[PDB]
Amino acid sequence: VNSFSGYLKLTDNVYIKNADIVEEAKKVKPTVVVNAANVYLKHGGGVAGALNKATNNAMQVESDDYIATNGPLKVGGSCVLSGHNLAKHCLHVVGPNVNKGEDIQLLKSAYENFNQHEVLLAPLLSAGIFGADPIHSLRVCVDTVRTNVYLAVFDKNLYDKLVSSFL
Ligand SMILES: OC[C@]12C[C@H](CN1c1ncnc3[nH]ccc13)C2
Incomplete structure (x- = not known):
C-alpha cells in the first residue's frame, strides 16, 4: 500500500491520472x-x-555540478x-526528442531505467515538447516497465484520449 490517490489502473503495475506532476510530488513526496x-x-x-522551478533552481544547481563532473547523459540514459x-x-x-531528430526506438531504452526503482511517479517520456505521440509513449511504458509506475498526464484532454484509446 502506498499514498498515491485517484489513479486509474491500466495494468498490474501501471497507473495513470490527470495531474500536474509538480503538485503530485509535493503532496505524495514519493x-x-x-x-x-x-x-x-x-x-x-x-x-x-x-520541477526545477518548484525547487527554487536547486535542481539546476545540482545538475550543473553533475554535468561538470560526468559530462552529458546518453539519449535513453x-x-x-x-x-x-x-x-x-x-x-x-x-527520452528521445523528436523535435531534434532523435531515434524513437530509444524510448524503450529510456523506460528501462524505471525498472531499477520499485515505485515511481513519472510523466510520459518523449511526450509534450519532446514531440512524440503520447499514445505510443504510454504503450511503450506499459510494455517495458515492470515496476510500479504512477503516470501524471498534465493535459486533461490528452488524458481522456489516452484512457479511451488504451488497449
Ligand atoms: O506526462 C504528460 C506530460 C506531457 C509531457 C509534459 N506533461 C506533463 N505531465 C505531468 N506533469 C507535467 N508538468 C508539466 C508538463 C507535464 C509529459
Whole structure:
C-alpha cells in the first residue's frame, strides 16, 4: 500500500491520472520522481522546467555540478540525483526528442531505467515538447516497465484520449 490517490489502473503495475506532476510530488513526496530530462540536464521547459522551478533552481544547481563532473547523459540514459523538496530522489531520464531528430526506438531504452526503482511517479517520456505521440509513449511504458509506475498526464484532454484509446 502506498499514498498515491485517484489513479486509474491500466495494468498490474501501471497507473495513470490527470495531474500536474509538480503538485503530485509535493503532496505524495514519493521516493522517486522522474524528470523528463535532456542530456545536458538543462531544465528549461516542459516537466523539467516545472520541477526545477518548484525547487527554487536547486535542481539546476545540482545538475550543473553533475554535468561538470560526468559530462552529458546518453539519449535513453538516466542519472539519480536529489529530489529536493519534491521527492527523496529524482530520476532524470532522457527520452528521445523528436523535435531534434532523435531515434524513437530509444524510448524503450529510456523506460528501462524505471525498472531499477520499485515505485515511481513519472510523466510520459518523449511526450509534450519532446514531440512524440503520447499514445505510443504510454504503450511503450506499459510494455517495458515492470515496476510500479504512477503516470501524471498534465493535459486533461490528452488524458481522456489516452484512457479511451488504451488497449
Ligand atoms: O506526462 C504528460 C506530460 C506531457 C509531457 C509534459 N506533461 C506533463 N505531465 C505531468 N506533469 C507535467 N508538468 C508539466 C508538463 C507535464 C509529459
